[PDB]
Amino acid sequence: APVTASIDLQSVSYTDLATQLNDVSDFGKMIILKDNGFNRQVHVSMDKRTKIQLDNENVRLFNGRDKDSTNFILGDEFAVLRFYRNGESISYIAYKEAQMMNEIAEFYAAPFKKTRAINEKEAFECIYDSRGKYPVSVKINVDKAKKILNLPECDYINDYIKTSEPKTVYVICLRENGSTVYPNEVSAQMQDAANSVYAVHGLKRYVNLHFVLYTTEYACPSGNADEGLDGFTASLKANPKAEGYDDQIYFLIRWGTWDNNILGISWLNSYNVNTASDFKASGMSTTQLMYPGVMAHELGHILGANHADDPKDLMYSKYTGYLFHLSEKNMDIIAKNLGWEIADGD
Amino acid sequence: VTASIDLQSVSYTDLATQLNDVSDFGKMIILKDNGFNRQVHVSMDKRTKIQLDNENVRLFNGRDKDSTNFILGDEFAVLRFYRNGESISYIAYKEAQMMNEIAEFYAAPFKKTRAINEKEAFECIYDSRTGKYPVSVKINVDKAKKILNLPECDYINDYIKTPSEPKTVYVICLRENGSTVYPNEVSAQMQDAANSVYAVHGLKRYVNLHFVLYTTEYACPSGNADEGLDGFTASLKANPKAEGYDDQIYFLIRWGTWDNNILGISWLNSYNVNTASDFKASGMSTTQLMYPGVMAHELGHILGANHADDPKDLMYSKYTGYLFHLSEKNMDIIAKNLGWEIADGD
Ligand SMILES: COc1ccc([C@@H]2CC(=O)c3c(O)cc(O)cc3O2)cc1O
Ligand SMILES: COc1ccc([C@@H]2CC(=O)c3c(O)cc(O)cc3O2)cc1O
Ligand code: PRO
Ligand code: PRO
Ligand code: PRO
Ligand code: PRO
Ligand code: PRO
Ligand code: PRO
Ligand code: PRO
Ligand SMILES: [Zn+2]
Ligand SMILES: [Zn+2]
C-alpha cells in the first residue's frame, strides 16, 4: 500500500499494456510482471534515444533496468513485452484490433499444428481474457519454439560485402515489393539493433537512431543475397524519394530469408558520421520473430564490426540469438565510426 | 535548407514527417504562406500526455512569440496559429476517406450560406500537383463564426457551487453515449485546457496533465446542463471502471451544447491535490472547433477560478475565444489548489 502496478501474463491484452506503458513518466514506473510461478518487479522507463515510425505510425520503446532484462514496444495498433527468463527470450504480443489479433494468433499458431508437440504451451500460447473467446495476446518463447519446430538452420556465413547533442541518424527501412511484414516483428528488430549500439561505449551521447519504414518498388531479382543487396543499393541511388538522404542508413526488409538460409547482408564498414555518402551504409534483413537480432548484426557490420570468435557475441559468424557486442575490437570500431574517442570514456 | 511546411499544400504526411523529426533540442520549421514565411522553433510538449481511445496524441509548441501549437496523432495532425488575434487551424487526416469526411463535415455549414469571405474562413487544401481530393482544411474559426452567424453560446451560470517531480493528474474524458466527436477537436480542447494551467505560476513544476478518452454509457437525461452534470457525477460514483480514480478530474464530452446555448458546466473549486475525492472534480464540455477553450474554461472553474471582469480573460462570463487566465486572484486560487505557494515564485 500504495499498490504497485502489475501485468497479469495469464490475461495480458493490448489495453493492459497500453494503459500501463502510457502511465510511464520521465522518472520511470515500477511494474510487476506476474504469471503462475513467476514474478518480476521491473523499473520501466521511456526510451528517449530511439524514434520509430512504421508507415508514419509512431512506435515508442520502453526499457527496464539492466538487471530487469525487460523491454517493451508500444504503437497504436500493437504492444510487445519481451523479457529473458532462465536464458530464454519470451514475447507477449498483443494487437489492439480483434481481426488483427486473430490473424496474428493464427499466423504464430500455424507452424505448431503439424508438429503438435506435447510441451507446445511453453513455446507458444494463445492468451485469453480472465472473464466464443478470442485471444487478447500470444506468448512466444522463441528458444523453446526453435526446439519444437524443424526450422532449417539459417546463418550469417558470408553475410557482408567488403567495399552536447547526439547526432540523429535515420535508419530507413524499406518493405521489399511483394513482401508482408508485421509491426511487432519489425519494431523488435529495430529495438534490438538500436540497443546493441547504445550498450557500446555510452554511444547514446553520440547518436540517436530514428527508424522509419516505407514500401519500396524494389524487389530482389533472385533469391541471392549478394545480387539482392547490389540491386537494393543501386535502387536507392535511382530513387527520387531517397534524394538528399545518401548519408543515412538503409535496410531492405522482408519476412523471409535469402538463398543458403542467409538471414541478412550488408556493406561492411560503410557508415561513418563524417564520411557517410552514396547510400553505402545499406543492407538487407529478415524481420521474422524467430531470428531476433539479425538487423542488429547487419547494423554491426555497417558500423565496421567483423565476425567475432565468442559464440555468445551478436557478431558470431553463426546465428545464436545473442543481442550484444562482446568484442572490444568491434566495440571500438563501431564507436569510433560514430564519433567516439578513447579519451571520452564511457 | 531549413525545414518548411507549405500552407498551400500541407498534408498529414508533411506535418508528421516534420513533427516526428523534432528532437529534445527543438527544431526550426518555416511556415510558408503566399510568399510570406514564419520561422517557428518547435519543441515537443513533455508536460501533457493524451490518449484518445488508447491512441497516443503528441503536442508540440512554438516559442511564446511564435503563437503556434501542433497536435500529432497517427490519424491526424493539427497546426494552429494566430493572425490578427484570429485562430487559424490546418487540420490534416492521414486516411483519404477520413480526410474527405472531415473536409465535407467542415464545408457543409458554408454551403447553405455562400459567403463572399468564404476562403479566408474555410478552405480545402489540395496537393501542389497542377479529380483531386483535399490533403487538409484551413479554418479561421473567428471568420467562420461571423459568416455562419451561429447562435451565441455562452458561460452564464456554467458552474455549480459545493516538488522535484510534478504530480500526474489524469483528466478522464468520457464521450457521452450516442455522441460523436472528432480527434482533432477533442485534442485541441485538451491542449488549450492544459496550456491555460501551465501558463499560470510555472504550474508545470506541480502538475503534468494526462488526458484520456473513453466512451461512457451515461447520457444526459435532458437538455439541462445542471441536471446533466448531477447525473454525470452520480454515474461516475456507480461506474466500476472509475473505481479507484475518484481523486482525478472528469469531463463528459460531446460535440454539441446544452439548453440556453450552454457550452459546458463544472463543479466550482472541486479539485485540490491534497483533498481530491468522490469524483467531485467533474464537469461537461463541448468539443466543437468553433468554440476553442471551453474545456480550459471549465477546468478553470474546477481548479477554483471564478468569472473574471476582463473581457479578454479565459474566465470572462461570456464566451470570447481567449485562452488564458488574466485574473491574478484566479491564478492564485488555481495554483494554490495544485500545491503552489507564493514563496515558491513562478
Ligand atoms: C526525414 O524524413 C524522411 C525519412 C525517410 C524518407 C524515405 C526516403 C526513402 O528512401 C523512401 C523510399 O525509398 C521509398 C518510399 O516509399 C518512401 C521513402 O521515404 C522520407 C522522409 O521525408
Ligand atoms: C490509464 O488508466 C486509466 C485511466 C482511465 C480509465 C477510465 C476510467 C473510467 O472512468 C472509465 C469509464 O468511466 C468508462 C470507460 O469505458 C472506461 C474508463 O476507463 C481507466 C484506466 O485504466
Ligand atoms: O484492445 C484489446 O485489448 C482487445 C483484445 C483484442 C481485441 N480487443
Ligand atoms: O511460462 C512462460 O511461458 C513464461 C515464463 C515467464 C512468464 N511466462
Ligand atoms: O571473441 C573475440 O573476438 C575476442 C577475441 C579474444 C577473446 N574474445
Ligand atoms: O575481454 C574479453 O574477453 C571481451 C570478449 C571478447 C573481446 N573482449
Ligand atoms: O499523404 C497525406 O497525408 C494525405 C492523406 C490523404 C491524401 N494525402
Ligand atoms: O508561399 C510559399 O512559399 C509556397 C510556394 C507555393 C505556394 N506556397
Ligand atoms: O479576433 C478576435 O477578436 C478573437 C478574440 C480572441 C480570439 N479571437
Ligand atoms: Zn555477419
Ligand atoms: Zn464559467
A125 is catalytic: no
Domain boundary among B149, B164, B191: B149
B6 and B138 part of one domain = yes
Same-domain pairing of B162 and B90 = no
Q: Give yes or no: residues B341 and B263 share one domain.
A: yes
C-alpha cell recorded at residue B56:
497516443
Pairing of strands B68-72, B55-61: antiparallel
d(CA B264, CA B157): 10
CB contact under 8 A, B23 and A96: no
End-to-end C-alpha distance for chain A, whole angstroms: 39
Residue B131 corresponds to which amino acid?
A: G
Measured distance CA(A42)–CA(A21) in Å, rounded: 12
Same domain, A12 and A24: yes
Number of H helices, E strands in chain B: 8, 16
- Grid coordinates representing A309 are 570468435
Q: Do B142 and B162 belong together in one domain?
A: no
> Using CA atoms in the order A308, A281, A273, B16, what is the torsion angle rounded to 10 degrees?
-120
The contact set of B with A (CB < 8 A) is 12-13, 16-17, 20-21, 23-25, 46, 49, 51, 54-56, 58, 72-74, 94, 165, 168, 208, 210
Ligand 9, atom 8: closest residue by C-alpha:
B86
| DSSP alpha helix (H) spans, chain B | 12-19, 96-112, 118-121, 141-148, 183-198, 225-237, 294-302, 328-337
Q: Distance between CA atoms of A262 and A153, rounded to whole angstroms?
A: 9
Number of CB atoms found within 10 A of residue B9's CB = 15
Q: What's the CA-to-centroid distance between B44 and ligand 1, angstroms?
A: 22
- Omega before A2 within 30 of 0, i.e. cis: yes
Site to probe by mutation for ligand 2, drawn from B241, B247, B252 as the one with most ligand atoms within 8 Å of Cβ, is: B241
> Is beta strand A78-85 parallel, antiparallel or unpaired with respect to A88-95?
antiparallel
Q: Is A26 annotated as a binding residue?
A: no
Which ranges constitute the DSSP H helices of B122-276? 141-148, 183-198, 225-237
Q: How determined?
A: X-ray
* Alpha-carbon span A113 to A102, nearest angstrom: 16
Q: Is A275 exposed, middle or buried (0-12, 13-18, 19+ CB in 10 A)?
A: exposed
Residue B94 Cβ < 6 Å to ligand 8: no
| One domain for residues B93 and B199 | no
Resolution limit in angstroms?
2.0
| Separation between Cα atoms, residue A167 and residue A191, nearest integer Å | 18
Q: How far off is chain B from A42, nearest CA to CA, in Å?
A: 20
Among the candidates A134, A150, A166, a domain finishes at: A150
Same domain membership, residue A271 and residue A139: no
Domain boundary among B149, B172, B198: B149
DSSP annotation of B132 reads -
B118 and B190 both lie in a single domain:
no
Handedness of CA A235, A241, A247, A248 (dihedral sign): negative
Task: Tell me A256's DSSP state.
Answer: S
Closest CA to B257 of B308, B220, B212: B220
Within this chain, do residues B85 and B179 fall inside the same structural domain, yes or no? no
To which H or E segment does residue B270 belong? none
Same domain, A220 and A317: yes
Grid coordinates representing A279 are 547510400
Answer whether A23's CB lies under 8 Å from A37's CB.
no
Q: Find out whether B220 and B231 touch, Cβ atoms under 8 Å.
A: yes
3-state class (DSSP) for residue A264:
strand
- For residue A257, what are the contacts with CB-CB under 8 A and spacing of at least 6? A154, A263, A286, A288
Q: Cβ(B312)–Cβ(B167) under 8 Å?
A: no
Interface of A with B (CB under 8 A): 14-15, 18-19, 22-23, 25-27, 48, 51, 53, 56-58, 60, 74-76, 96, 165, 168, 208, 210
Tally Cβ neighbours within 10 Å of residue B91. 28
Cα B30 from Cα B4, distance rounded (Å):
4
Number of domain units in chain B? 2
Q: List C-alpha distances in Å: B187 to A60, B58, B286, B293.
A: 20, 9, 12, 11
The answer on A104 and A157 residing in a single domain is: no
Domain residue limits at A308? 151-346
CA A21 to ligand 4 center in whole angstroms: 20
How far is CA A53 from its chain centroid?
Answer: 14
Mode of pairing for the β-strands spanning B55-61 and B49-52: antiparallel
Say how far apart CA A69 and CA B117 lie, in whole Å: 61
Query: What are the beta bridge partners of residue A53?
Result: A58, A212
CB B191 within 8 A of CB B58: no
Same domain, A107 and A168: no
C-alpha torsion angle, residues A267, A270, A271, A273 (rounded to 10): -170
Q: Which helix (H) or strand (E) holds A120?
A: helix A120-123
Coil, strand or helix at A160: strand
What distance in angstroms lies between residue B93's CA and the mean position of ligand 3's atoms?
24
